[PDB]
Design a protein around this ligand. Sequence first.
Ligand code: HEM
Length: 184
Amino acid sequence: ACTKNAIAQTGFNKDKYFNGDVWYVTDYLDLEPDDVPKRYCAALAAGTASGKLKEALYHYDPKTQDTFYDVSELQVESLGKYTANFKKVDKNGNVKVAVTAGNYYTFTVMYADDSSALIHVCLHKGNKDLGDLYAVLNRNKDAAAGDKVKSAVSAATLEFSKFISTKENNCAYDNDSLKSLLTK
Ligand code: HEM
């Protein structure tokens, strides 16, 4: 179940966020903690490709080796709040699972600056969801969360101390695939 109407950042700068570059998940929190593993790797690229607002996703479970990529087309609900479809793809953009009625996520940018962000995601696959999922992002895969984003976590009435870090998982990412997937 998802339970939060996440509030987007006041004055969110869409073009800076959706600039074609990669964001790494450094820390995450699911309000239903059992919905996701205790160790995980995730990243995304976000940009406009031929006029279309896109995200490319990467998930990797460092214990099981489960790996998957997605390409998403985003629709705008309001500034910084989107509804995204998704198709599962290989790293080269070949479709494994097509865009499907009932497979979508909401995506809210609660805070962002040039280097860091806080997002909320509510994933739906049919009648299933993956709970309220918060993630701290950085442009640098190894950056410890700084004061701007940690304060934003507090301003969301959350506690950064309770987020799970991805930093001790030897996460390695294919940035080139994430960038090219934006076009697919
Ligand atoms: C970076 C923002 C993220 C977004 C937008 C996102 C979105 C998604 C989407 C679209 C899927 C379904 C993929 C498919 O079936 O084709 C998925 C699956 C999944 N995600 Fe995320 N995700 C993000 C980060 C994370 C993080 C940080 C975790 C933490 C463990 C996580 C855990 C999972 C798990 C466990 C699944 C598999 C769910 C299932 O089997 O039903 N995700 N995610």
